[model samples]
Target chain A: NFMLNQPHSVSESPGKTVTISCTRSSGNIDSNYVQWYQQRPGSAPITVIYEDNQRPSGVPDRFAGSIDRSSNSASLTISGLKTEDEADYYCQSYDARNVVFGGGTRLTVLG
Target chain B: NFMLNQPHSVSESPGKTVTISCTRSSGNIDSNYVQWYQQRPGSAPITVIYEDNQRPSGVPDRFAGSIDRSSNSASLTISGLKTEDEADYYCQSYDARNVVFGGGTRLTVL
Candidate 1:
């Protein structure tokens, strides 16, 4: 399935980098898969990663996530954040396709 | 495409009826597909409804939904609700391969 929704914020300029985080309220992060999304304004969010650090077929390498299974926290970092990146970002839990989504993170490209 | 997560709560009794609503913050719901989910604690959520009011094959009849495309609102109604029904409920937006979820609604049996 899919996760609900949340909002996170990222501020940076073009060619800069930014990071968004997802902290599992409870669970073994290693066992549970974590996915990230990139949503531009007026468009649906697209999956960028799955299973902690694995990128899906066609997702760019700049979209990345790391897991600290011990702390139950997962993080996604986007390098060279662009103006098109000025939208929403989200994280998901992948277990039996059952999902939980981070509220969301807004990436603002600064001048 | 998937949605983020939100905490939603529902209260009721066995055999009682309850409804969970998902209102798009801003969008044309008709142009978009809507889906619902059921997630009991300690377990992952399952898809119960999709495409406005369409149920994925095999979902029980007790779970149902209605859509007001004009208002950009979608609702999930479970009849003869059970204690096991006390779980999180979510609504999803189907746009392209991307989707959006309403903050979850939690169901608590009284």
Candidate 2:
């Protein structure tokens, strides 16, 4: 019985850096690893990060994932932000075989 | 990257069951774990089933996940559906550490 919590929205300028955070309500944050997903409008989510901090091959290196046991949370950081990076991001993790997802963070790239 | 295909839309009356199928183009259906997510409009998707058939404790038993190696596909079956069940469903799987999502299915429970 756990939940993932995330901010509802964030705004940052293009060409800057923004990090979205997902925190766990209970248990060790790294117990089963976490995955981050990006969903553009009118599209399904794509895994930008999996297995904690590993990015899928097709994803750019600017997109990185990290874990912070101190905070019981995982994060998705996008550097050199582009308009394309403006989307809804969600964090996911497993709990005793069941899966949970963060409410989601909407990133808006300010011009 | 592998692609998962699903029907664009499906409809069923209340109390009837609806199954959404997701077929992988380049990965073995049984090689990696499969998951199902349910998304209501204007909300984040929630996992109904994970690791093929394990339903979340909070999710009702009516939601079941299955895999068919013969068909190279995974299915999410919702039995005894209610009108509230009408939503978008998606199938997800991973291979070689990369994750993939199905095109997504729109389930309309009338």
Candidate 3:
């Protein structure tokens, strides 16, 4: 089946770096823009990265995004992780005219 | 933060038609493509409509989307609602720099 797969969870500490991956199974992964979103508990998801690796205004510099065409995957890397970064991260991409999202990875910031 | 306002909730019976609206603030509605997503409980959201009113592959025709430039708003109308369609709906649009989503509307199917 066509799906965007992600790890179930990951643990990290403040001031550390964590990388979350979004892998595609059956689609044009490189031809489309891979977007990333962050959703806090009980809140709507916000776009942190769009069109592969572009960040929106007011977003901190600690967040970065990248795509690996060979691996059919996209990644969101967070440097200097903070407690506020403890939320679900989702990766989305367009397949032709359709948009698909990963199941999401829940990041836990350990003290 | 740019806001996309939506009604808190809406209720309709199965086989009935319902429309949910998302109003934009602080941006040009006509300059962006409006997308709608459906989120069922315990599942990732799925895009149903994109680029204002284009349906994604496998999405049922019962779901339709539209954008009103004059009102700075977008809407999704569902006809022949089913019990499985009881879920939260969100509208999204790109503001050149970032993608913004509406507050979301919870649809209750009676």
Candidate 4:
């Protein structure tokens, strides 16, 4: 998505698992290096994932992420979906000489 | 911060200046890459900054960002802070192929 374009957005049911991804034009994203964030309504975004394909220090496991360097793709999977998980998810590329993030995937948890 | 942890948050005062940054471990983020977002109260996160150190089309000029390869850091600066600019700021790395983010540095404009 463009800066003016809100490209990162998704939709899912409350009980279903939703996965969001980030794809780049070209480059090699190294290993154990990628990040993800979740921004709840009216609140600041929080770090949900970091390096090692793991969650942040105090985050819950329900939120997970994965990355494929060769494909230049990164993904975040939210499990045990809850109404609270309804927010925007972002994927950040950490290596290869530049900094960037996904267009941002908006996950709408419907009943 | 860990996946099981809440790592992205900052403290900034209203009418004051604030800049949040994300730093990575090791990787090469190519040029003309990266993205930032703004999530207002009760609303979905909106795109603010993307590749080329530019602001999203609809976003105002107060929200801005920059990336430095040498330090492995991407920063977002919110100028002339307003209550509307009180959302969380995130720096995402879109390079080398690996997806990563810095431990979010929250900017609280009080």
Candidate 5:
């Protein structure tokens, strides 16, 4: 039951702020390194956040990662969103036995 | 060209075996470990192989991983294919730069 569950989809207009949360199903969300990836249509997934909210070189600062211990969830917040930010985001972590991934959240930047 | 490369698609019959390859573009494939993932439509990926040839718990033994030093590539071989196994498979690896994923090979069990 260690699934990382996320919202099915979320939409916001440009310049708006949106946060997608990933709730751990069975374990504490803070126990392991949480990584986030961005997947555009027909492309391979790329890391947007990894290991302590660090963004990859090409990723923008608008993408931020945080943990909410009280909720037992981790979140990816995007600020000043743009249409180009539209894509699917997945949150992932691992335990001793296997890796766990969120159901995935589709972020649509509405016009 | 520091990337992990993979084929666009693979077709196999049920009960047969098919191998998807991931070629290293820059670094030596053997120097660092490789991981394989399976992604079904509308779902996030699950790791089938991690840290070289190790398989995660709950994953079937028919799924195997290997390295090809002469070809500078890594491979994920799945045997006894089934309809449920039809999905996109990706190979990922890390270099000093960052985590990179292959384009993904779509497996169609015919």
Candidate 6:
């Protein structure tokens, strides 16, 4: 069955780099159509990356995404992480007409 | 980015029917794909309808979706509603490279 799996939680210090991973089963992550979303506490999920790496306007450049075709996984890399970067991240993919989402990863940034 | 507007809250009694509407701004709602999702508290959202009216397997027939091209709006209709049907509903519209989400409608079943 097609599914998406992500880490449960990650903790990092401000100004450090952290990568959140999303692995898929039964589909190609390299399809280059995977999207990522950011959900702040008590807020709606916001689109962060679309089509693997394109960022929308008003989204910070420090947030980037990449797909590891060899590992069947995708990742979101956050650099110069600020306290505001603390939130839950989710990965999404489309299979035919089905939209699939991972369980989500919660990131805690410490000063 | 294109936007989707939906009601903030709606209420109805069990065994009745209710519709959640999502209006699009500056885009066509009949452009082949409009998706709806159901989000329960403390859980990731589940896809209820895809491409306007197609339901994925395991979704009950009571749930339906449609789009009105003239008004550029989409709707999700739940028939024979039950308490379990009460949840936050969101509509999504996809542009070429991005997907836009509605503000979300909280459906309450009394």
Best by DockQ: 2
TM-score to true structure, per model:
0.51, 0.95, 0.92, 0.51, 0.93, 0.93
* Chain A accuracy as TM-score for every candidate: 0.80, 0.97, 0.94, 0.79, 0.95, 0.95
Off by over 4 Å in 3: none
State the number of backbone clashes in model 1.
21
Using lDDT as the yardstick, the better of models 3 and 4 is: 3
Q: Model 5, A2-111: lDDT tens per residue?
A: 88899999999999999999999887899988888899987889988887487878788999999999999999999999998999999988887466788999999986
Q: Evaluate model 2: give its lDDT.
A: 0.90
Q: Give fnat of each prediction, in order.
A: 0.05, 0.72, 0.82, 0.00, 0.62, 0.46
Model 5 CA lDDT for position A64: 96
Relative to the true structure, candidate 2 reaches a TM of: 0.95
Which is the leading candidate under lDDT? 2
Q: Which model scores highest in TM-score?
A: 2
Model 1 lDDT per residue over A12-104, tens place: 878887877777665566667676766564343456766678776567787887976665678888897777667777676643533455766
Angstrom error at residue B71, model 6: 2.1
Model 4, span B1-110: residue lDDT tens: 11111236766667777776655554543443666756544444555777737774567887777776787666677877887777655555433333334434455566
lDDT of 5 by residue, B1-110 (tens): 27889999999999999999999998799978899999987888989999868998889999999999999999999999989999999998877645678999999999
TM-score of 4: 0.51
Per-residue lDDT value at B10 in model 3: 98
Ranked by lDDT, the better of candidates 2 and 3 is: 2
TM-score of 1: 0.51
Tell me the tens digit of each residue's lDDT in model 1 across B1-110: 43334345768888988888877666566767676867664333467876667666567899988987675678899999877778778677654433455767877988
Which residue pairs come into collision in candidate 3? none
* Displacement of the residue B50 alpha carbon in candidate 5, Å: 1.3
Instruction: Give per-residue CA lDDT, model 6, range B37-76, as digits (tens).
Output: 9988677788999989999988999999998888899999
For each candidate, the DockQ is 0.08, 0.80, 0.78, 0.09, 0.65, 0.63
Please give the TM-score of chain B in predicted model 4: 0.74
